[PDB]
Swiss-Prot record:
Protein name (database record): Mitogen-activated protein kinase 14
UniProt lineage: Eukaryota, Metazoa, Chordata, Craniata, Vertebrata
Modified residues (Phosphothreonine): T12, T243
Subcellular location(s) per record: Cytoplasm; Nucleus
CC terms in the record's Gene Ontology section: cytoplasm; cytosol; extracellular region; ficolin-1-rich granule lumen; glutamatergic synapse; mitochondrion; nuclear speck; nucleoplasm
InterPro entries documented for this protein: Kinase-like_dom_sf (IPR011009), MAP_kinase (IPR050117), MAP_kinase_CS (IPR003527), MAPK14 (IPR038784), MAPK_p38-like (IPR008352), Prot_kinase_dom (IPR000719), Protein_kinase_ATP_BS (IPR017441)
Cited PROSITE patterns: MAPK (PS01351), PROTEIN_KINASE_ATP (PS00107), PROTEIN_KINASE_DOM (PS50011)
Any GO MF annotation of the entry: MAP kinase kinase activity
Family annotation (SMART domains): S_TKc (SM00220)
């Protein structure tokens, strides 16, 4: 067990192993405070997140368990991974705080285009998405603030920020569709790619209604092939009661863009999620010919998500989280 040291920062206490030095607060964080730091053991600059009230309730405890399970599983260049996880607690009985460590990241996709850069950035997204989707994991919330980018133009998918979420959301989500397929994320990639090509948010709807209205103006109202798969009586009536609109030609909309990029957008931004191109198929699209390598686009180990359907007590999610802290094996050097 490492030797811990204790210090207060931004009016909250921090107890971390000695290896992490020069803690500098970077923000309040999503659900916990974050500091930059220097990892003396590896030489890496890192981010340490102290989760806030991680076992306050059953929802909080399951969410804490979920976050640790996800980060421990992700082992891929274009997906955020876990350098370390620790607690100052010496036993389950006194276990109350959880700290997560990963590589320090500077800019997100907003803070960073030529067509070569769009190719490379979207390629890395799809490569990380292929890995995530292969583990039966849906991101559901892809957007530029969730994508970290180096000056190297290297990119990682995150599930947090360092830009309304609705702008990149698949339409089936905003219709509160019961089931979702992995290509909700491909829709988001399409919106992101269009923005990198035009410099403008593709669908900057003010709300969900305005959002769907903007979407339909580009892709057209559902055809009969899609209408026959809509089970909601109300959703079907409203859709059909709209003035039908034709799917625009994307060449006209994305004028001057690389025609291969326009073609890929047409295969991504399809209403019928059954017809959207998958991440694996998109990596083989001719638009990525100079980056695509089928032998270096790996899939993930299977991810056991059975816990999502369980209703457990707080102390049980806490104990399961403790098991995952204890069993952690750091990445090698
Ligand atoms: C110009 O700008 C900068 C200049 C200098 C800087 O440094 C001194 C920085 C710091 C940049 C930074 O924030 N870098 C960072 C953050 C995280 C985060 S952010 C988060 N939640 N944030 C929210 C907040 C609100 C809503 C949603 C999410 N969680 C983790 C995190 C996740 C996992 C983990 F193991 C550790 C930390 C991870 C890695 N790098 C910026
Ligand atoms: C100013 C920066 C100081 C960094 C100190 C990192 C100290 C890591 O200290 C740890 O102490 C243990 C007990 O001696 C040893 O068993 C570990 O191998 C060692 O890494
Ligand atoms: C590797 C971390 C960045 C990519 C994360 C992709 C998966 C996000 O994961 C999703 O988060 C949702 C909200 O907690 C959960 O409800 C879903 O069950 C979970 O699959
Ligand atoms: C005007 C708004 C139209 C929204 C159309 C959304 C079509 C989404 O596509 C649908 O997604 C469902 C859930 O994954 C699938 O079960 C259906 O098979 C698929 O066609």
């Amino acid at each position: 067990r490492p030797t811990f040291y204790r210090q207060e920062l931004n009016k909250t206490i921090w107890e971390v192993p000695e290896r992490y030095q020069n803690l500098s607060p970077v923000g309040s964080g999503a659900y916990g405070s974050v500091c930059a730091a220097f990892d003396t053991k590896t030489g890496l600059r890192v981010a340490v997140k102290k989760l806030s009230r991680p076992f306050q309730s059953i929802i909080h405890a399951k969410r804490t368990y979920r976050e640790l399970r996800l980060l421990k599983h992700m082992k891929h260049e274009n997906v955020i991974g876990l350098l370390d996880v620790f607690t100052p607690a010496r036993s389950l009985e006194e276990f109350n705080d959880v700290y997560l460590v990963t590589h320090l990241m500077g800019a997100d996709l907003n803070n960073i285009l030529t067509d070569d850069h769009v190719q490379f950035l979207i390629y890395q997204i799809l490569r990380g998405l292929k890995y995530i989707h292969s583990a039966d994991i849906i991101h559901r919330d892809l957007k530029p603030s969730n994508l970290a980018v180096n000056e190297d133009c290297e990119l990682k998918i995150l599930d947090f920020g360092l830009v309304a979420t609705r702008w990149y959301r698949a339409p089936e989500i905003m219709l509160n569709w019961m089931h979702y397929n992995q290509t909700v994320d491909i829709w988001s990639v399409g919106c992101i790619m269009a923005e990198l090509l035009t410099g403008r948010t593709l669908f900057p709807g003010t709300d969900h209604i305005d959002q769907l209205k903007l979407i339909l103006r580009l892709v057209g109202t559902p055809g009969a092939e899609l209408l026959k798969k809509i089970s909601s009586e109300s959703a079907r009536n409203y859709i059909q009661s709209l003035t039908q609109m034709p799917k625009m030609n994307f060449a006209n909309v994305f004028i001057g863009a690389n025609p291969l990029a326009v073609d890929l957008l047409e295969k991504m931004l399809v209403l019928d999620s059954d017809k959207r191109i998958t991440a694996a198929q998109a990596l083989a699209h001719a638009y990525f010919a100079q980056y695509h390598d089928p032998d270096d686009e790996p899939v993930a180990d299977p991810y056991d998500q059975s816990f999502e359907s369980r209703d457990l007590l707080i102390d049980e999610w806490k104990s399961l989280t403790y098991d995952e802290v204890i069993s952690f094996v750091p990445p090698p050097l």
